[PDB]
Paper text:
Human DNA licensing initiates replication fork assembly and DNA replication. Helicase loading is a multi-step process that hORC-hCDC6 initiates. By blocking ATP-hydrolysis, it is possible to assemble a hOCCM intermediate, which incorporates all human DNA licensing factors except hORC6. The structure highlights how hORC1 activates the hCDC6 ATPase and uncovered an unexpected role for hCDC6 ATPase in complex disassembly.
The final 3D reconstruction from 8730 particles resulted in a structure with an average overall resolution of 6.09 Å. In the hOCCM complex, hORC1-5-hCDC6 adopt a ring-shaped organisation with DNA located in the centre, the complex is organised by an upper C-terminal tier made up from the AAA+/AAA+-like domains and an N-terminal, lower tier made up of the WHDs (left). Consistently, we observe that 38 bp of dsDNA running through the core of the hOCCM has a length similar to the 39 bp observed in the yOCCM structure. Large sections of the structured N-terminal and C-terminal domains of hCDT1 (aa182-317 and aa413-546) can be seen in the structure, with the N-terminal section of hCDT1 binding to the hMCM2/hMCM6 interface and the C-terminal section to hMCM6/hMCM4, its position within the hOCCM seemingly similar to yCdt1. Interestingly, more substantial changes can be observed outside of the hORC1-hORC4-hORC5 motor module. Specifically, hORC2 and hORC3 are rotated by 12.8°, which generates a gap between hORC1 and hORC2, that accommodates hCDC6.Fig. 6 hORC-hCDC6 in the hOCCM structure. Inspection of the interface of hORC1 and hCDC6 revealed that a loop in hORC1, which has been unstructured in the context of the hORC1-5-DNA structure, became structured within the hOCCM and formed a short helix. This hORC1 helix contains the conserved arginine finger, which we observed to be proximal to the Walker B motif of hCDC6. Thus, the hOCCM structure suggests that hORC1 and hCDC6 form upon complex formation an active ATPase pair. Crucially, the AAA+ domain of hCDC6 stabilises the hORC2-WHD in the hOCCM, thus revealing its active conformation (left). Importantly, when comparing the hORC1-5-DNA structure with the hOCCM, it is clear that the hCDC6-induced 12.8° rotation of hORC3 enables the hORC3-hMCM2 contact, as this pushes hORC3 further out and generates proximity to the hMCM2-WHD.
Author numbering:
A (entry chain 4): 122 to 420, 441 to 773
B (entry chain 7): 361 to 480
C (entry chain G): 445 to 546
D (entry chain 6): 20 to 251, 293 to 616
Write the structure that this text describes.
């Protein structure tokens, strides 16, 4: 938009008295429609680039920029060397300098952002006037101080700087948008740059020297275009409400911002919440009563880390955290003991130099029992706390509909792909029930998801190989929902041998008929049945520590094997092979050997130590030993 | 019973009762009386209509561009009495959704897209 | 022995690296983004593991033809593309004869 | 403009000053062919133009759409001095030989007017269609014929007629014998599976070639088109010029299509590829040292390492007396592992050899990988779409889990291991092609493990017609001794503890790919002392087949 400036003086009179001195007749000029003047906003921004000192700036992140010296004074020699004339200015630095300029940028970023593009050019010419680039230096403000949602969009926030973080599902193709028009005369040679601002189409009927109507043909092959990438984004899963589906806002990206945000990441979108009337007919100027809400995209503390390190040295942290996942059942701690190590998994390693690049270090736990007795709380509690959890139904959803399938789409004239549920929870945890009565076609597609970590689907002329991987848990059930001592554990599980062998541990919900067994289970649920909320926050820690305990070791401590603690894995592998009695000479595959290494990496990750000793190795084989006696 | 949801989790509640009997032993007297007795209880039986219109009725709303899923006996009977006859005659898909709406009374809908939790 | 085949590509890469910086229209760039930009542009069937090796054993011999430094993210690589190849080839040929004469 | 005129006068002198091999110019022999009006070849080398001028060739590739009519009038004037030509036929610049290649994912908004080169491969094939270039209209208002009507990218109509009184603001009339057309093909390219390391977003791009660029354009060409991207409602189209079918991505320039002598290949290859394949080819353990240097994570089992190396080479597609090519490729498959350790055998080949696919049982239906047929949505015509077996020509296709599949898919692939061709005529649409792709199958037992009580034919699902058309058949050796698990466990510890340090290969992967093209050069022959040794060894396996009386298990 190119708006004019209207002076705010008395119409019809030049100056009513007031000699020499300037009383109420100074610089009252301002843009008509905005309380931001170019002659006033530019002067307030030049001092922001010269008189701004941030002593609290770090050195590992601001390499090349001095801390004591002004930061923006050293950035003059950085824009002309990176190639692209686009300066990255953080909105947090503006509030710490002037509070008046910070409120004018967010309230109306339509004329303040273009004003900043002309102030940097004046300072850049006073330092390196010889170094030139493509077009001019533009300012891309990002990282605001507002965190709202699509439902809290007040009607007073129209055409303002709103920053809402989310997750991008999929992106569109490339839609060229012709900006400046280009024409060529059919008689002479003359170029004309017609500004097609505000979505207007017009062509001049008078040439340069020919001066003949209908003699200047249009050529749309030498003008400047711009790709229009339609990016969709909804509410972030970490701050979304429960009980309703989130709203998706359409995002636009032009210039160099096209193909920058990959679909499937969590990038803070900083744009301007604008609104344009939908044009029904491109010929006749029609205005729709329902506008289109579009947003033009522009671009831990130390009080909690020290508390997590003190608990790592305590030898009781592994027992306190394992009992926090049992809010009702007192016993049966060995069932949920392996679930705590599932969120950690282990540090993923790369071996592309030997022909084996992809490798997953996640732990897959296998459960079995009655779906409702003791498994009703272990399927809905790991979904509300963990933000990377995706719940889905087995029988309610199709086999190919859960993953990434192919579906017709006559809108884009291309057989595009669609997302699912487990393909979005990468590096997290997937939630899925009903594994004993699941579909036959669904069991077949799981032979390469959690095994090969590469979903290769080549059908209907669609060559696509997905690289999504996520630890999936299961909860089986016998043919009679009860253990039968007359038959072995092999006949009870109806799953084939190739399916149960891909899982690590194995447990089973047993209900003994002992009289003394109810003395330690029935006397516990009644004690907490009449008690309200006068003991939950007194004898048990809060849930705010568990969410912050796993968000630190997953990107700081990378444990690895050594030379002494790794020798115990060979001797323990030979002893667990000649089992017999139950099934026979089995367990002769590198499956249980690979899963045993994942158990040692998960135990050392909770202890906050990259060095793995022989203590954590003895604890890995102890969990596998209890799984054998449970199913026998 | 008690509906306070302590210790983070949610305890059980709502009285449950099952009855087996041939539909014809004056069962309508025990059903029509309890239907008008409870303020939030609609007269729904096992027959009279299709099985995909009383517990899983999908309505394709093309006026707004969404996808909803309603029932007929467990979507509008909050803190009331759910009246239904012939508990063992429908398909297995209709009896699977009862595993979560009966214990803690939480409607779980997850058919690839519809991600919501109804409270009834 | 890991750089013997690299010295043979010096008269070959002198003409390939000259055209890839002109057709891209972009003046200056970096080496971090070069792992996914010019990795498929230069006609080299060798593994990408040795792609960051020719950017150090060539600019240090001729600092005038290519001047750059190292940091941690988005470096500043400036290649003098305004020089004729009639004299650049004679400059890189001085160090080539010294390698085969050892 | 005077800028475009300066780039044409100096370019005219380049065809006479810059020499080629001797004291003759390569364009001199090309001028003798342009006299005959049926061939218009104007090949211009870019690696040789920079030797005479560098700053002049910068504006040529930067702004090519504007200098398009200037190249047609400059080359026509230069050839006029050689010999007088008629004034009734135009030409077309055939600029090829570009050492710079651009990726399909590397594009912005100012890619128009840039003379670059795009890689990839074409799948769909469309027939030829003319294009109005030099036409002649006729005003229906004053009955006047207007000549010299050039059509660019829109409907260029004469807004002002010859009579300066009125004009025709509607439609005209297409001339008959006074309109020159140029046919083209609207093929559909596709991203290559060997250049997408991250992200799986398949798409295509409109490619339009010239008149003489036809013929050599069929479903299965891995060529790289060269031209300039043109912007059209508002769509995208890459105006190509010539074709050059070579190896995927980079690679060599000779395989099984062009044959020459041994003295002309040494002048094109590098000097580092001579002594490497000379002193190492005289060893005695060359067939064994290449097995451990490629699979360091596999301990023992020498029967699976010596068959994967021979899978890439194998036999050659010969020709019978009547002129019909039969077999010429080796096939192998393993069985005896419930997809626990055989998965690494297909991954090492997929990363190494770029001409390979990867799929499972349920991921491949009846067609898809062979030849899919579906009616087009914007043309309404039964087309033929290539599969995965046609893109991996002269290579090897991978497939795992041979159990979760029906019976209709095995019937449609029976002509792959015996005839190595695709003959699908569906709907009166003939589509008979050929592909020399070996099937790297991997059978899976019924109960997961090999049952010792049942017979050897009761543990697999493969019948007799399937195994008869297949070549080599291996079975994974299963040993239940205390020394088997004691030796394989030591290799796992050294791999997970010493990251990127357990590999001790004697030959790196850079020289293994170089020795792949030397095998397809000198074709070996058959000695006169070997015909008596083959006739005496087949009778041994003939009695080994009939263990009982006549038939038994594997038929040979």
């Amino acid at each position: 938009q190119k708006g004019l400036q209207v002076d705010l003086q008395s119409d019809g009179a030049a100056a009513e008295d007031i000699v020499a001195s300037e009383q109420s007749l100074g610089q009252k000029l301002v843009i008509w429609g905005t309380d931001v003047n170019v002659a006033a906003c530019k002067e307030n921004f030049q001092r922001f680039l010269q008189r701004f000192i941030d002593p609290l700036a770090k050195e590992e992140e601001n390499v090349g920029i001095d801390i004591t010296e002004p930061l923006y004074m050293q950035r003059l020699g950085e824009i002309n060397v990176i190639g692209e004339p686009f300066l990255n200015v953080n909105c947090e630095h503006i509030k710490s300098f002037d509070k008046n300029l910070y409120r004018q940028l967010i309230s109306y970023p339509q004329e303040v952002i273009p004003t900043f593009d002309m102030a940097v050019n004046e300072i850049f010419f006073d330092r390196y006037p010889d170094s030139i680039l493509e077009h001019q230096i533009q300012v891309r403000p990002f990282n605001a101080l507002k965190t709202k949602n699509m439902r809290n969009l007040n009607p007073e926030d129209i055409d303002q700087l709103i920053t809402i973080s989310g997750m991008v599902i999929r992106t569109s193709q490339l839609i060229p948008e012709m900006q400046e028009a280009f024409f060529q005369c059919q008689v002479c040679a003359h170029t004309t740059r017609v500004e097609m601002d505000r979505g207007r189409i017009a062509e001049p009927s008078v040439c340069g020297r020919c001066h003949t109507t209908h003699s200047m043909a249009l050529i749309h092959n030498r003008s400047l275009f711009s790709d229009k990438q339609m990016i969709k984004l909804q509410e972030s899963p970490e701050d979304m409400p429960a009980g309703q589906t989130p709203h998706t806002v359409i995002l636009f990206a032009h210039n160099d911002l096209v193909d920058k945000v990959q679909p499937g990441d969590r990038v803070n979108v900083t744009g301007i919440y604008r609104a344009v009337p939908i044009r029904v007919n491109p010929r006749v100027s029609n205005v729709k009563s329902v506008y289109k809400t579009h947003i033009d995209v522009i671009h831990f503390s130390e009080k909690r880390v020290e508390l997590l390190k003190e608990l790592s040295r305590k030898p009781d942290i592994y027992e306190r955290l394992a009992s926090a996942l049992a809010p009702s059942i007192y016993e049966h701690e060995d069932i949920k003991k392996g679930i705590l190590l599932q969120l950690f998994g282990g540090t993923r390693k790369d071996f592309s130099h030997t022909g084996r690049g992809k490798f997953r270090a996640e732990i897959n736990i296998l459960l079995c029992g009655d779906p409702g007795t003791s498994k009703s709380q272990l399927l809905q509690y790991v979904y509300n706390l963990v933000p990377r959890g995706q719940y889905t139904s087995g029988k309610g959803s199709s086999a190919v509909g859960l993953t990434a399938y192919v579906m017709k789409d006559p809108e884009t004239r291309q057989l595009v792909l669609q997302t699912g549920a487990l393909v979005l929870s990468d590096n997290g945890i997937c939630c899925i029930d009903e594994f004993d009565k699941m579909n036959e076609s669904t069991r077949s597609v799981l032979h390469e998801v959690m095994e090969q970590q590469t979903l290769s689907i080549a059908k209907a002329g669609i060559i696509c190989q997905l690289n999504a991987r996520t630890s999936v848990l299961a909860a089986a059930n016998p043919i009679e929902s009860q253990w039968n001592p007359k038959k072995t554990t092999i006949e009870n599980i109806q799953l084939p041998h190739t399916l149960l062998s891909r899982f690590d541990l194995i447990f089973l919900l047993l209900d003994p008929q002992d009289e003394a067994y109810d003395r330690r289970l029935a006397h516990h649920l009644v004690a907490l049945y009449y008690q309200s909320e006068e003991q939950a926050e007194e004898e048990l820690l809060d849930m705010a520590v568990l969410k912050d305990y796993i968000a630190y070791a997953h990107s700081t401590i990378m444990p690895r094997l050594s030379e002494e603690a790794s020798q115990a894995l060979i001797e323990a592998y030979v002893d667990m092979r000649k089992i017999g009695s139950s099934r026979g000479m089995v367990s002769a595959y590198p499956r249980q050997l690979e899963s045993l290494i994942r158990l040692a990496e998960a135990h050392a990750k909770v202890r906050l130590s990259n060095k793995v000793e022989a203590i954590d190795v003895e604890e890995a084989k102890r969990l596998h030993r209890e799984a054998l006696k449970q199913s026998a | 019973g008690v509906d306070q949801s302590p210790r983070g989790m949610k305890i059980r509640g709502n009285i449950n009762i099952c009855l087996m009997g041939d539909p014809g032993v004056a069962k309508s007297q025990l059903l029509s009386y309890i239907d008008r007795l409870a303020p939030r209880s609609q007269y729904t039986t096992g027959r009279g209509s299709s099985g995909v219109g009383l517990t899983a009725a999908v309505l394709r709303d093309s006026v707004s561009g969404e996808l909803t899923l309603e029932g007929g006996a467990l979507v509008l009977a909050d803190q009331g009495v759910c009246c239904i006859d012939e508990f063992d005659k429908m398909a297995e898909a209709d009896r699977t959704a009862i595993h979560e709406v009966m214990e803690q009374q939480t409607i779980s809908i997850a058919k690839a897209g519809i991600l919501t939790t109804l409270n009834a | 022995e890991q750089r013997l085949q690299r010295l043979e590509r010096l008269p070959e890469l002198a003409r390939v690296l000259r055209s890839v910086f002109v057709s891209e229209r972009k003046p200056a760039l970096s080496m971090e983004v070069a792992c996914a930009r010019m990795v498929g542009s230069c006609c080299t069937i060798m593994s990408p593991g040795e792609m960051e090796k020719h950017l150090l054993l060539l600019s240090e011999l001729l600092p005038d033809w290519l001047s750059l430094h190292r940091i941690r993210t988005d470096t500043y690589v400036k290649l003098d593309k305004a020089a004729d190849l009639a004299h650049i080839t004679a400059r890189l040929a001085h160090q080539t004869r010294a390698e085969e004469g050892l | 403009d005077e800028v475009a005129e300066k780039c044409q006068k100096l370019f005219l002198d380049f065809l006479e000053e810059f020499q080629s091999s001797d004291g003759e110019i390569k364009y001199l022999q090309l001028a003798e062919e342009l006299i005959r009006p049926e061939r218009n070849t104007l090949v211009v080398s870019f690696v040789d133009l920079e030797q005479f001028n560098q700053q002049l060739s910068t504006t040529i590739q930067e702004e090519f759409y504007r200098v398009y009519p200037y190249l047609c009038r400059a080359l026509k004037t230069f050839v006029k001095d050689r010999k007088e030509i008629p004034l009734a036929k135009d030409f077309y610049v055939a600029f090829q030989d570009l050492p710079t290649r651009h990726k399909i994912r590397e594009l912005t908004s100012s890619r128009i007017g840039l003379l670059t080169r795009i890689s990839g491969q074409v799948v769909r094939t469309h027939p030829v269609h003319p294009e109005l270039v030099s036409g002649t209209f006729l005003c229906l208002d004053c009955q006047t014929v207007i000549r010299d009507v050039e059509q660019q990218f829109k409907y260029t109509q004469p807004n002002i007629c010859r009579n300066p009184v009125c004009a025709n603001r509607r439609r005209f009339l297409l001339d008959t014998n006074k309109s020159r057309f140029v046919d083209f093909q609207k093929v559909r390219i596709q991203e290559t599976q060997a250049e997408l390391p991250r992200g799986s977003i398949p798409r295509s791009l409109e490619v339009i070639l010239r008149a003489e660029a036809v013929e050599s354009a069929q479903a299965g060409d891995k060529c790289d088109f060269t031209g300039t991207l043109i912007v059209v409602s508002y769509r995208l189209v890459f105006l190509a010029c010539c074709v050059a079918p070579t190896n995927p991505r980079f690679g060599g320039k000779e395989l099984r299509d062009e044959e020459q002598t041994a003295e002309s290949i040494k002048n094109q290859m590098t000097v580092k590829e001579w002594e490497k394949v000379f002193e190492m080819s005289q060893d005695k353990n060359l067939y064994h040292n290449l097995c451990t240097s490629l699979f360091p994570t596999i301990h023992g089992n020498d029967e699976v390492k010596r068959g994967v190396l021979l899978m890439l080479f194998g036999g050659v597609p010969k020709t019978t007396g009547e002129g019909t090519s039969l077999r010429g490729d080796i096939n192998v498959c393993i069985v005896g592992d419930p997809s626990t350790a055989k998965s690494q055998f297909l991954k090492h080949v997929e990363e190494f050899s770029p001409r390979a696919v990867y799929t499972s049982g349920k991921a491949s239906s009846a067609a898809g990988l062979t030849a899919a047929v579906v009616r087009d949505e914007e043309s309404h015509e039964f087309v033929i779409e290539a599969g995965a077996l046609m893109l991996a020509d002269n290579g090897v296709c991978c497939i795992d889990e041979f159990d979760k599949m029906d019976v209709r898919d095995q019937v449609a692939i029976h002509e792959a291991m015996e005839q190595q061709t695709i003959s699908i005529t569906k709907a009166g649409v003939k589509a008979t092609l050929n592909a020399r792709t070996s099937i790297l199958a991997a059978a899976n037992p019924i109960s997961g493990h090999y049952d010792r009580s049942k017979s050897l034919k009761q543990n697999i699902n493969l019948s007799a017609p399937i195994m008869s058309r297949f070549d080599l058949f291996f079975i994974l050796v299963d040993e239940c001794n205390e020394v088997t698990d004691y030796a394989i466990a030591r290799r796992i510890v050294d791999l997970h503890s010493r990251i990127e340090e357990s590999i001790d290969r004697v030959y790196s992967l850079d020289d293994i790919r170089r020795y792949l093209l030397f095998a397809r050069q000198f074709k070996p022959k058959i000695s006169k002392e070997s015909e008596d040794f083959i006739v005496e060894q087949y009778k041994h396996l003939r009695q080994r087949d009939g263990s009982g009386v006549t038939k038994s298990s594997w038929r040979i």
